[PDB]
Protein backbone atom coordinates (compact mmCIF):
# COMPACT_ATOMS: atom_id res chain seq x y z
CA UNK A 1 0.00 0.00 0.00
CA UNK A 2 2.40 2.66 1.31
CA UNK A 3 -0.02 5.59 1.40
CA UNK A 4 0.94 9.26 1.55
CA UNK A 5 0.75 12.45 3.56
CA UNK A 6 1.52 15.76 1.85
CA UNK A 7 4.18 18.41 1.21
CA UNK A 8 4.05 22.06 2.33
CA UNK A 9 3.04 21.43 5.95
CA UNK A 10 3.66 17.66 6.15
CA UNK A 11 0.60 16.30 7.95
CA UNK A 12 -2.03 13.56 8.06
CA UNK A 13 -4.46 13.35 5.16
CA UNK A 14 -8.17 13.54 5.87
CA UNK A 15 -10.66 12.78 3.11
CA UNK A 16 -13.45 15.00 1.79
CA UNK A 17 -16.05 14.57 -0.94
CA UNK A 18 -15.92 16.15 -4.38
CA UNK A 19 -19.56 17.26 -4.22
CA UNK A 20 -20.32 18.67 -7.70
CA UNK A 21 -18.48 15.73 -9.32
CA UNK A 22 -19.35 12.87 -6.91
CA UNK A 23 -16.00 11.26 -5.99
CA UNK A 24 -13.57 11.11 -3.06
CA UNK A 25 -10.88 13.70 -2.33
CA UNK A 26 -8.25 13.87 0.41
CA UNK A 27 -6.91 17.01 2.06
CA UNK A 28 -5.26 18.81 4.97
CA UNK A 29 -6.57 20.95 7.82
CA UNK A 30 -3.43 23.01 8.37
CA UNK A 31 -3.13 24.66 4.95
CA UNK A 32 -5.39 23.84 1.97
CA UNK A 33 -3.50 21.22 -0.13
CA UNK A 34 -5.71 18.45 -1.64
CA UNK A 35 -4.92 15.26 -3.58
CA UNK A 36 -7.41 12.59 -4.65
CA UNK A 37 -7.94 9.32 -2.76
CA UNK A 38 -5.40 6.55 -3.32
CA UNK A 39 -7.82 3.79 -2.31
CA UNK A 40 -11.43 3.58 -1.02
CA UNK A 41 -10.20 1.74 2.10
CA UNK A 42 -9.86 3.94 5.17
CA UNK A 43 -9.96 1.71 8.26
CA UNK A 44 -9.90 -2.00 9.10
CA UNK A 45 -10.27 -3.66 12.52
CA UNK A 46 -9.66 -7.43 12.33
CA UNK A 47 -10.71 -9.24 15.54
CA UNK A 48 -9.14 -12.51 14.39
CA UNK A 49 -5.70 -11.56 13.10
CA UNK A 50 -3.39 -13.50 10.73
CA UNK A 51 -0.94 -10.72 9.93
CA UNK A 52 2.44 -10.84 11.64
CA UNK A 53 2.79 -14.60 11.63
CA UNK A 54 5.44 -14.39 8.94
CA UNK A 55 7.32 -11.91 11.24
CA UNK A 56 10.60 -10.52 9.82
CA UNK A 57 12.51 -13.36 8.15
CA UNK A 58 15.82 -11.98 6.86
CA UNK A 59 17.92 -14.59 4.98
CA UNK A 60 20.16 -14.65 8.08
CA UNK A 61 17.37 -16.60 9.85
CA UNK A 62 19.51 -19.69 9.12
CA UNK A 63 22.45 -18.87 11.41
CA UNK A 64 20.33 -18.69 14.59
CA UNK A 65 21.14 -22.15 16.13
CA UNK A 66 18.16 -21.96 18.51
CA UNK A 67 15.88 -22.92 15.60
CA UNK A 68 14.65 -26.47 14.63
CA UNK A 69 15.65 -28.44 11.52
CA UNK A 70 13.14 -30.09 9.17
CA UNK A 71 13.88 -32.24 6.13
CA UNK A 72 10.89 -31.38 3.93
CA UNK A 73 11.09 -29.74 0.50
CA UNK A 74 10.17 -26.23 -0.67
CA UNK A 75 7.67 -25.53 -3.49
CA UNK A 76 10.47 -24.29 -5.80
CA UNK A 77 14.15 -25.23 -5.43
CA UNK A 78 13.16 -28.61 -3.97
CA UNK A 79 15.79 -28.72 -1.22
CA UNK A 80 15.62 -30.59 2.12
CA UNK A 81 16.97 -28.22 4.78
CA UNK A 82 14.11 -26.19 6.24
CA UNK A 83 13.40 -24.38 9.53
CA UNK A 84 10.06 -23.62 11.22
CA UNK A 85 8.03 -22.30 14.17
CA UNK A 86 4.51 -21.19 15.13
CA UNK A 87 2.81 -17.82 14.69
CA UNK A 88 4.53 -14.95 16.51
CA UNK A 89 1.14 -13.43 17.20
CA UNK A 90 1.02 -13.64 20.99
CA UNK A 91 -2.75 -14.03 21.06
CA UNK A 92 -4.28 -16.44 23.56
CA UNK A 93 -6.75 -17.36 20.80
CA UNK A 94 -4.23 -18.10 18.01
CA UNK A 95 -3.68 -21.66 16.76
CA UNK A 96 -0.67 -23.99 16.82
CA UNK A 97 0.27 -24.89 13.24
CA UNK A 98 3.86 -24.93 12.03
CA UNK A 99 4.96 -22.61 9.24
CA UNK A 100 8.12 -23.71 7.47
CA UNK A 101 10.60 -21.60 5.52
CA UNK A 102 13.40 -22.88 3.29
CA UNK A 103 16.80 -21.15 3.17
CA UNK A 104 16.74 -21.60 -0.62
CA UNK A 105 13.53 -19.72 -1.58
CA UNK A 106 11.64 -18.40 1.57
CA UNK A 107 8.21 -20.01 1.23
CA UNK A 108 5.73 -20.43 4.12
CA UNK A 109 4.47 -24.01 3.77
CA UNK A 110 2.81 -25.65 6.76
CA UNK A 111 2.62 -29.14 8.24
CA UNK A 112 -1.11 -28.87 8.94
CA UNK A 113 -3.70 -31.44 7.82
Amino acid sequence: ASFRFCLECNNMLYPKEDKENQRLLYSCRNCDYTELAEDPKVYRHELITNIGETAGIVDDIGQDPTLPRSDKECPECHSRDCVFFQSQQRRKDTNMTLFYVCLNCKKTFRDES
Binding site: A1, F5, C9, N11, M12, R44, Q88, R90, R91
Partner: protein, 235 residues
Amino acid sequence: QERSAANIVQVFKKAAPSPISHVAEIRSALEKGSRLISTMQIKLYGREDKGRTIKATLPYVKQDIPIVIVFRALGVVPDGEILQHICYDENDWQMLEMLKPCIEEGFVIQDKEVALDFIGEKRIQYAKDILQKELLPHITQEEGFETRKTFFLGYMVNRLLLCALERKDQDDRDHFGKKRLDLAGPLLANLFRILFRKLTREIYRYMQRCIELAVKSTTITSGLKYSLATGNWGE
Protein backbone atom coordinates in the same frame (compact mmCIF):
# COMPACT_ATOMS: atom_id res chain seq x y z
CA GLN B 1 22.84 -6.25 46.47
CA GLU B 2 20.74 -7.15 43.42
CA ARG B 3 18.72 -4.50 41.54
CA SER B 4 16.76 -4.39 38.26
CA ALA B 5 19.30 -3.03 35.72
CA ALA B 6 18.93 0.42 34.16
CA ASN B 7 18.87 1.83 30.61
CA ILE B 8 16.71 -0.98 29.15
CA VAL B 9 13.37 -1.20 27.31
CA GLN B 10 10.49 -2.97 29.09
CA VAL B 11 6.66 -3.13 28.84
CA PHE B 12 3.98 -3.93 31.43
CA LYS B 13 0.22 -4.49 31.05
CA LYS B 14 -1.84 -2.82 33.77
CA ALA B 15 -4.99 -4.60 35.10
CA ALA B 16 -8.59 -4.17 33.86
CA PRO B 17 -9.43 -1.79 36.71
CA SER B 18 -7.32 1.24 35.73
CA PRO B 19 -7.59 4.21 33.35
CA ILE B 20 -4.26 2.99 31.89
CA SER B 21 -3.90 0.03 29.51
CA HIS B 22 -0.19 -0.77 29.21
CA VAL B 23 3.03 1.09 30.13
CA ALA B 24 6.74 0.98 29.27
CA GLU B 25 9.50 2.19 31.57
CA ILE B 26 13.24 2.84 31.40
CA ARG B 27 15.53 3.52 34.35
CA SER B 28 18.37 5.84 33.38
CA ALA B 29 21.66 6.69 35.09
CA LEU B 30 25.08 7.87 33.91
CA GLU B 31 27.29 4.76 33.79
CA LYS B 32 30.13 6.98 35.03
CA GLY B 33 29.35 10.30 36.68
CA SER B 34 27.02 11.04 39.63
CA ARG B 35 24.36 8.49 38.56
CA LEU B 36 20.98 10.20 38.75
CA ILE B 37 18.06 8.01 39.80
CA SER B 38 15.16 9.50 37.87
CA THR B 39 13.16 7.15 35.67
CA MET B 40 11.19 7.90 32.50
CA GLN B 41 7.56 6.81 32.46
CA ILE B 42 5.76 6.61 29.11
CA LYS B 43 2.25 5.53 30.11
CA LEU B 44 -0.73 4.73 27.89
CA TYR B 45 -4.14 5.55 29.40
CA GLY B 46 -7.40 4.17 27.98
CA ARG B 47 -7.58 0.38 28.46
CA GLU B 48 -7.59 -2.10 25.58
CA ASP B 49 -11.19 -0.99 24.85
CA LYS B 50 -12.53 2.42 25.97
CA GLY B 51 -12.75 5.34 23.55
CA ARG B 52 -6.98 5.76 24.10
CA THR B 53 -4.47 8.57 24.70
CA ILE B 54 -0.72 8.28 25.18
CA LYS B 55 0.94 10.24 27.99
CA ALA B 56 4.42 10.18 29.52
CA THR B 57 5.84 11.35 32.84
CA LEU B 58 8.69 13.84 33.12
CA PRO B 59 10.64 14.95 36.22
CA TYR B 60 8.98 18.00 37.89
CA VAL B 61 5.92 17.92 35.61
CA LYS B 62 2.65 17.83 37.59
CA GLN B 63 0.45 15.98 35.10
CA ASP B 64 1.61 13.83 32.15
CA ILE B 65 2.35 14.94 28.58
CA PRO B 66 1.01 13.52 25.26
CA ILE B 67 3.86 12.24 23.02
CA VAL B 68 2.81 14.47 20.08
CA ILE B 69 3.88 17.74 21.73
CA VAL B 70 7.21 16.10 22.71
CA PHE B 71 8.13 15.71 19.01
CA ARG B 72 7.30 19.28 18.03
CA ALA B 73 9.02 20.38 21.25
CA LEU B 74 12.22 18.67 20.08
CA GLY B 75 12.45 20.18 16.62
CA VAL B 76 10.27 18.04 14.39
CA VAL B 77 6.88 19.62 13.75
CA PRO B 78 5.62 17.87 10.62
CA ASP B 79 4.19 14.35 10.23
CA GLY B 80 5.73 11.63 8.03
CA GLU B 81 9.14 12.90 9.13
CA ILE B 82 7.95 11.74 12.55
CA LEU B 83 6.63 8.33 11.46
CA GLN B 84 10.05 8.10 9.83
CA HIS B 85 11.45 7.64 13.31
CA ILE B 86 8.58 5.59 14.76
CA CYS B 87 7.65 3.08 12.03
CA TYR B 88 10.20 1.43 9.75
CA ASP B 89 7.59 0.15 7.29
CA GLU B 90 5.05 2.52 5.64
CA ASN B 91 2.98 -0.65 5.07
CA ASP B 92 2.02 -1.36 8.68
CA TRP B 93 -1.42 0.30 8.70
CA GLN B 94 -2.33 -1.41 12.01
CA MET B 95 0.25 0.42 14.14
CA LEU B 96 -0.45 3.70 12.31
CA GLU B 97 -4.23 3.53 12.98
CA MET B 98 -3.85 3.53 16.79
CA LEU B 99 -1.84 6.75 16.54
CA LYS B 100 -4.59 8.69 14.66
CA PRO B 101 -6.69 9.80 17.71
CA CYS B 102 -3.42 10.92 19.37
CA ILE B 103 -2.23 13.38 16.65
CA GLU B 104 -5.59 15.18 17.09
CA GLU B 105 -4.82 15.65 20.81
CA GLY B 106 -1.75 17.80 20.11
CA PHE B 107 -3.33 19.27 16.95
CA VAL B 108 -3.86 22.36 19.17
CA ILE B 109 -0.11 23.14 19.35
CA GLN B 110 1.34 23.98 15.93
CA ASP B 111 4.99 24.89 16.78
CA LYS B 112 8.07 24.80 19.03
CA GLU B 113 7.18 27.97 20.98
CA VAL B 114 3.97 26.80 22.65
CA ALA B 115 5.39 23.25 22.74
CA LEU B 116 8.16 24.25 25.19
CA ASP B 117 5.67 26.66 26.78
CA PHE B 118 2.83 24.44 28.06
CA ILE B 119 4.84 22.83 30.91
CA GLY B 120 3.83 24.68 34.06
CA GLU B 121 9.62 32.90 27.76
CA LYS B 122 10.87 32.15 31.28
CA ARG B 123 9.58 28.58 31.19
CA ILE B 124 10.49 28.13 27.51
CA GLN B 125 14.06 29.10 28.41
CA TYR B 126 13.69 26.73 31.36
CA ALA B 127 12.13 24.17 29.00
CA LYS B 128 15.49 23.74 27.25
CA ASP B 129 17.15 23.09 30.64
CA ILE B 130 14.65 20.27 31.34
CA LEU B 131 15.75 18.69 28.03
CA GLN B 132 19.50 18.79 28.65
CA LYS B 133 19.37 17.78 32.33
CA GLU B 134 16.03 16.05 32.92
CA LEU B 135 14.94 14.46 29.64
CA LEU B 136 16.52 10.98 29.30
CA PRO B 137 19.62 12.20 31.28
CA HIS B 138 21.80 9.16 30.38
CA ILE B 139 23.24 8.81 26.81
CA THR B 140 24.87 12.27 27.36
CA GLN B 141 23.82 15.80 28.30
CA GLU B 142 26.00 17.60 25.72
CA GLU B 143 24.11 19.59 23.09
CA GLY B 144 24.14 18.84 19.36
CA PHE B 145 22.76 15.31 19.64
CA GLU B 146 18.98 16.05 19.68
CA THR B 147 18.43 13.89 16.56
CA ARG B 148 19.39 10.48 18.01
CA LYS B 149 17.03 10.61 21.02
CA THR B 150 14.17 11.34 18.60
CA PHE B 151 14.93 7.98 16.95
CA PHE B 152 14.92 6.46 20.44
CA LEU B 153 11.59 7.92 21.59
CA GLY B 154 10.31 6.40 18.33
CA TYR B 155 11.86 3.01 18.98
CA MET B 156 10.23 3.02 22.43
CA VAL B 157 6.61 3.78 21.44
CA ASN B 158 7.30 1.06 18.85
CA ARG B 159 8.44 -1.61 21.32
CA LEU B 160 5.32 -0.60 23.26
CA LEU B 161 2.71 -1.35 20.60
CA LEU B 162 4.65 -4.48 19.52
CA CYS B 163 3.26 -5.84 22.80
CA ALA B 164 0.04 -3.79 22.93
CA LEU B 165 -0.89 -5.62 19.70
CA GLU B 166 -0.31 -9.12 21.05
CA ARG B 167 2.79 -9.74 18.93
CA LYS B 168 5.29 -9.82 21.80
CA ASP B 169 4.58 -10.93 25.36
CA GLN B 170 4.91 -8.68 28.39
CA ASP B 171 8.51 -8.28 29.57
CA ASP B 172 9.64 -10.95 32.04
CA ARG B 173 10.03 -8.97 35.28
CA ASP B 174 12.37 -11.56 36.83
CA HIS B 175 14.59 -12.26 33.83
CA PHE B 176 17.87 -12.15 35.83
CA GLY B 177 19.73 -11.01 32.71
CA LYS B 178 18.12 -7.60 33.10
CA LYS B 179 19.24 -7.47 36.73
CA ARG B 180 22.60 -6.25 38.02
CA LEU B 181 24.57 -6.70 41.26
CA ASP B 182 26.14 -3.75 43.05
CA LEU B 183 29.22 -5.39 44.59
CA ALA B 184 31.55 -3.71 47.09
CA GLY B 185 33.32 -1.33 44.69
CA PRO B 186 30.08 0.18 43.29
CA LEU B 187 28.47 0.66 46.73
CA LEU B 188 31.31 2.90 47.96
CA ALA B 189 30.10 5.40 45.31
CA ASN B 190 26.42 6.26 45.77
CA LEU B 191 27.29 6.25 49.48
CA PHE B 192 30.32 8.50 49.04
CA ARG B 193 28.51 11.10 46.91
CA ILE B 194 25.82 11.59 49.60
CA LEU B 195 28.73 12.15 51.98
CA PHE B 196 31.15 14.15 49.83
CA ARG B 197 28.16 16.32 48.88
CA LYS B 198 27.65 17.06 52.58
CA LEU B 199 31.42 17.48 52.71
CA THR B 200 31.14 19.78 49.72
CA ARG B 201 28.67 21.99 51.55
CA GLU B 202 30.57 21.49 54.83
CA ILE B 203 33.74 23.21 53.64
CA TYR B 204 31.16 25.78 52.52
CA ARG B 205 30.22 26.37 56.15
CA TYR B 206 33.78 27.02 57.32
CA MET B 207 33.96 29.70 54.60
CA GLN B 208 30.68 31.01 56.00
CA ARG B 209 32.26 31.75 59.38
CA CYS B 210 35.56 33.14 58.10
CA ILE B 211 35.07 36.86 58.68
CA GLU B 212 38.38 37.11 56.81
CA LEU B 213 43.41 22.93 58.54
CA ALA B 214 39.90 22.89 60.10
CA VAL B 215 38.80 19.84 58.09
CA LYS B 216 38.11 17.19 60.74
CA SER B 217 38.83 14.15 58.55
CA THR B 218 36.92 11.85 60.92
CA THR B 219 33.47 12.46 59.40
CA ILE B 220 34.57 10.47 56.35
CA THR B 221 36.04 7.91 58.74
CA SER B 222 33.17 7.63 61.23
CA GLY B 223 30.50 7.94 58.52
CA LEU B 224 31.82 4.88 56.66
CA LYS B 225 32.08 3.04 59.99
CA TYR B 226 28.43 3.64 60.97
CA SER B 227 27.10 1.93 57.85
CA LEU B 228 29.49 -1.06 57.78
CA ALA B 229 29.00 -1.53 61.55
CA THR B 230 25.20 -1.57 61.62
CA GLY B 231 24.04 -1.95 58.03
CA ASN B 232 22.59 1.48 57.33
CA TRP B 233 24.11 2.88 54.13
CA GLY B 234 22.55 6.33 53.73
CA GLU B 235 24.68 8.59 55.94
